[PDB]
Amino acid sequence: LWVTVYYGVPVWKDAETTLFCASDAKAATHACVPTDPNPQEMVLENVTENFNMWKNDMVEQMHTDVISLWDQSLKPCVKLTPLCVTLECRQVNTEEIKNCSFNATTELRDKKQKVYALFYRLDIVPLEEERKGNSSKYRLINCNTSACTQACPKVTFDPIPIHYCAPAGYAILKCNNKTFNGTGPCNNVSTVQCTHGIKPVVSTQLLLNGSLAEGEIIIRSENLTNNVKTIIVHLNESVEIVCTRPNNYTRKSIRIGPGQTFYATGDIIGNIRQAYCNISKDDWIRTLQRVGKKLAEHFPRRIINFTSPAGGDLEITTHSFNCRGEFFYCNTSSLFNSTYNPNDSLDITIPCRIKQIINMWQRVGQCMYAPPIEGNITCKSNITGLLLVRDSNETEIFRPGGGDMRNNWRSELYKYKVVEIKPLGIAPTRCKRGFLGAAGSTMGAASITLTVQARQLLSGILGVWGIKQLQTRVLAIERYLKDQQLLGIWGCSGKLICTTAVPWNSSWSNKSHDEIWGNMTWMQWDREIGNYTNTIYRLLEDSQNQQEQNEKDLLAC
C-alpha cells in the first residue's frame, strides 16, 4: 500500500486559545464584538469525549476578562484620598449608622470646609477612643491600605451576558449528557461556534440567575472525598429570592477637590429599617431535602447536616450579594439550619448588612466605594445553585461557602471544551501516485463525505483587547499558511485527496486495508499512527517530492 494525503480530516486536539469576546448584538461593552452568536449546534452522532470542568481554561480566561473589564470602568473615577482624615462621629438621632464630620478640601487648596456624611459602622474603624454615647473618633476603613476609588455615575453593575466564540480552526464542544458530573466521558456531544450567554453574576454561597439543570439536581466536585474542595450544586428548579433596602437615603454631593465630588449618604427619611431578603420557605426546604438525598447517594450511611455558616468573618460568612450597585452581606445561617436522614407568610427572613467599601475579587488595595443609591432598592432573583463545603461523627457537615469567583463560572462553563482542528492526515491506500459532522463514523465513510465537507474549512480563511484580536488574526494566518505550505511541498494542490509515491510501512500499522478503513474513525487512526507524523512528512517532502521532480524535469534540459 501507499501513503495518501488527506485534507479536511475531522480530528482535533485539546487546545487552549484566546476566545473572542462577543457581546449582545442588541447592546464594558466596547471591548467585545456585538454580533450574533449564531449557535448553529451540530450533534456528533456516536461521539464520546472527555471533559473536565476543573481544568477548563475558559474559566480562567473568563475570570481574567471579567476582572479586567470591571477595572476599566473605574479607571476614570475619583480616588478618595481627601477623605482619609480623622472623622468625628456621633450617633444618628433620626445603631449601625453614624454621623461623621470631616474637614474636606475645597475647590481651592488653601481652604477647608466642615462637612458631614453618614456611614455604616462596617466601613468605619475606631481610633484610640471609646464610645462615650455622644461622640468618638474614627478612620475610614482601608485608609491604611488604599486610596479607595468612588464608582462613577454610570458605572454599570448590569451582568450583561458574555458569549465566547471560537477562532477559526477551533471549535467548542458542548456536553449534552444530562447528569454528567463534570469529569470523565460525555457520550453526547455537539459543537458550536459560540457558547450561550453567561451572565457574570457575582455572589458567594448562593448562585443566582444561572442556568437550571435539565434533569435532577446535580452535585459536582473536583474530588468529593476532599474536604478542601468546593461542591457545586446545580438545581433543576429555581428558588425565589427577593432582597431589599427599605430605608430611603438621600444622596448629597460634597466637593472634595478641584473638579471632583464625593457622594455622601444623608437625610434619612424618617424611619430606620434593616435590609433583608425574602426567601420562599417551602421551596427552600424542598430544595435542601432533595440536595440532602443526592448527597446521601455520594455519602451513604451518614447523617447529613446543612447546619453551619463559616464562623463569623463577614467577608466569608455571609451571602455576598449585589442589588443595583448596592452591596449586601446577608446572614444565611437561618437557611442552612437543617439535617437529613434517609431512613428516618411561609417565608424565611434573612437580615442583611450593607457595606460601601468593597474589596472586590478578594484583591487587597483594589478598593471600590459604592455611592448611595436613592429610591426603591429592590432586586428579585433566582437561586439556581449552591456552593457547599464539606467539613468522625458519622455525619457529613456542610457549610455554604465561596469567595473564589471561578466557581461561579465553572457552574456555567462546565458544559464546554475548546479543541483545535487538525485537517491534515494520512492513511494507506492501494494507489501509488459542519466540518466535524463526519465524526464518529469510520474513516471510509468520512472520506466520501470529505470530498465536499473539507471545503467548510475554507470558511476560516481598546488596548489589550486590540492585541487579543491581532494575535488571533495573525495566528489564524500563520496556521493557514503552514498547512498550505506543507501541501505545496508535498505536491498536493487539489488537496482534498493526494496520492503520493511514499510506500506504507507495516511498522506504522500492520492492519489491513479494510481493517483500517472500515473499523476506525479518523481520531482513532490519528492516535494509532500519531508518532510517525514527522516520519511521513520527511518522506514526502525531502524525498518523494524532490526525486519526482528532479528525475523527470531536469532530464528535459
Ligand X SMILES: *[C@@H]1O[C@H](CO)[C@@H](O[C@@H]2O[C@H](CO)[C@@H](O[C@@H]3O[C@H](CO[C@H]4O[C@H](CO)[C@@H](O)[C@H](O)[C@@H]4O)[C@@H](O)[C@H](O[C@H]4O[C@H](CO)[C@@H](O)[C@H](O)[C@@H]4O)[C@@H]3O)[C@H](O)[C@H]2NC(C)=O)[C@H](O)[C@H]1NC(C)=O
Ligand Y SMILES: *[C@@H]1O[C@H](CO)[C@@H](O[C@@H]2O[C@H](CO)[C@@H](O)[C@H](O)[C@H]2NC(C)=O)[C@H](O)[C@H]1NC(C)=O
Ligand Z SMILES: *[C@@H]1O[C@H](CO)[C@@H](O[C@@H]2O[C@H](CO)[C@@H](O[C@@H]3O[C@H](CO)[C@@H](O)[C@H](O)[C@@H]3O)[C@H](O)[C@H]2NC(C)=O)[C@H](O)[C@H]1NC(C)=O
x/- mask, ligand Y, residues 91-130, rule CB under 6 A, reads -xxx----x-xxx----------x-x-x------------
**Planar angle of CA 128, 129, 134, nearest 5 degrees:** 160
Shortest distance, CB of residue 42 to ligand NAG, whole angstroms? Answer: 28
All three cell numbers of 403, joined, read 469567595
User: Which of residues 68, 106, 135, 159 is near ligand X by CB under 6 A?
Assistant: 159
Q: Which of 18, 188, 124 is nearest to 357 (CA)?
A: 124
Q: Which does 337 bind (CB under 5 to 8 A by kind): ligand Y, a copy of itself, ligand Z, none?
A: none
244 binds ligand X (CB under 6 A): no
Shortest distance, CB of residue 123 to ligand Y, whole angstroms? Answer: 16
223 binds ligand Y (CB under 6 A): yes
Contact stretch for ligand X (CB under 6 A) within 40-48, 122-130, 376-384, 441-449: 376-384
Q: CB of 28 within 8 A of CB of 69? A: yes
380 binds ligand X (CB under 6 A): yes
Q: Where are the beta strands (DSSP E) in 54-182?
A: 87-91, 97-105, 112-120, 124-126, 135-140, 149-150, 163-165, 170-175
Distance separating alpha carbons of residues 32 and 477, to the nearest angstrom: 21
The number of residues that bind a copy of itself (CB under 8 A) is 55
SS3 294: helix
Q: Which does 507 bind (CB under 5 to 8 A by kind): ligand X, ligand NAG, a copy of itself, none?
A: ligand NAG
> What one-character DSSP code corresponds to residue 555?
G
Q: How many CA atoms lie within 13 A of 35 on its CB side?
A: 14
Distance separating alpha carbons of residues 411 and 402, to the nearest angstrom: 13
- The cell 474549512 sits on which residue? 457
DSSP letters for 338-377 = EEE-TT---EEEEEEEE-SEE-GGG-SS--EEPPP--S--
Shortest distance, CB of residue 161 to ligand X, whole angstroms? Answer: 11
Radius of gyration of the chain (CA): 31
485 binds a copy of itself (CB under 8 A): yes
Residue 172 vs 386, nearer CB to ligand Z: 386
Residues 6+ apart with CB under 8 A from 332: 205, 206, 309, 318, 319, 350, 400
User: Which of residues 99, 146, 149, 381 is near a copy of itself by CB under 8 A?
Assistant: 146
Q: Which residues bind ligand Z (CB under 6 A)?
A: 216-217, 236-237, 290, 293
Residue burial 230-269, b: 16+ Cβ < 10 Å; e: rest: bbbbbbeebbebebbbebbbeebebbbbeebebbbbbebe
Q: CB of 367 within 8 A of CB of 357? A: yes
Q: Where are the beta strands (DSSP E) in 221-373?
A: 230-244, 250-257, 260-266, 275-280, 303-306, 319-323, 326-330, 338-340, 347-354, 357-358, 368-369
Residue 290 vs 468, nearer CB to ligand Z: 290
221 binds ligand Y (CB under 6 A): yes
All three cell numbers of 50, joined, read 472527555
Shortest distance, CB of residue 289 to ligand Z, whole angstroms? Answer: 8
Q: Which residues bind ligand NAG (CB under 6 A)?
A: 248, 269, 301, 341, 343-344, 375-376, 378, 503-505, 507, 528-532
> What one-character DSSP code corresponds to residue 19?
P
x/- mask, a copy of itself, residues 8-27, rule CB under 8 A, reads --------------------
All three cell numbers of 135, joined, read 461622640
Antiparallel, parallel or unpaired: β 230-244 and 378-390:
antiparallel
46 binds ligand Y (CB under 6 A): no
Distance separating alpha carbons of residues 195 and 38, to the nearest angstrom: 10
User: Which of residues 26, 109, 114, 301 is near a copy of itself by CB under 8 A?
Assistant: 109
Q: Is 494 left (phi over 0), alpha (psi -120 to 50) or beta?
A: left
Q: Which does 343 bind (CB under 5 to 8 A by kind): ligand X, ligand Y, ligand NAG, none?
A: ligand NAG
Residue 36 φ then ψ, to 5°: -85, 115
Shortest distance, CB of residue 190 to ligand Z, whole angstroms? Answer: 22
Shortest distance, CB of residue 242 to ligand NAG, whole angstroms? Answer: 9
Q: Which does 278 bind (CB under 5 to 8 A by kind): a copy of itself, ligand Y, ligand X, none?
A: ligand Y
Contact stretch for a copy of itself (CB under 8 A) within 160-168, 191-199, 438-446, 449-457: 449-457
246 binds ligand X (CB under 6 A): no
What residues between 176 and 235 interact with a copy of itself by CB under 8 A?
Answer: none
Instruction: Tell how far CA 156 is from the center of its chain.
Output: 19
Contact stretch for ligand Y (CB under 6 A) within 141-149, 153-161, 183-191, 410-418: 183-191
190 binds ligand Y (CB under 6 A): yes
Shortest distance, CB of residue 8 to a copy of itself, whole angstroms? Answer: 12
User: Which of residues 184, 351, 466, 518 is near ligand Y by CB under 6 A?
Assistant: 184
Q: CB of 496 within 8 A of CB of 6? A: yes
Distance separating alpha carbons of residues 104 and 255, to the nearest angstrom: 8
Residue 66 vs 330, nearer CB to ligand Y: 330
Shortest distance, CB of residue 261 to ligand X, whole angstroms? Answer: 18
Binding footprint of ligand X on the chain (CB under 6 A): 158-159, 201, 208-209, 322, 324, 379-381
Residues near ligand Y, by CB under 6 A = 41, 43, 86, 88, 92-94, 99, 101-103, 114, 116, 118, 176, 181, 183-185, 188, 190, 220-221, 223-226, 268, 276, 278, 347-349
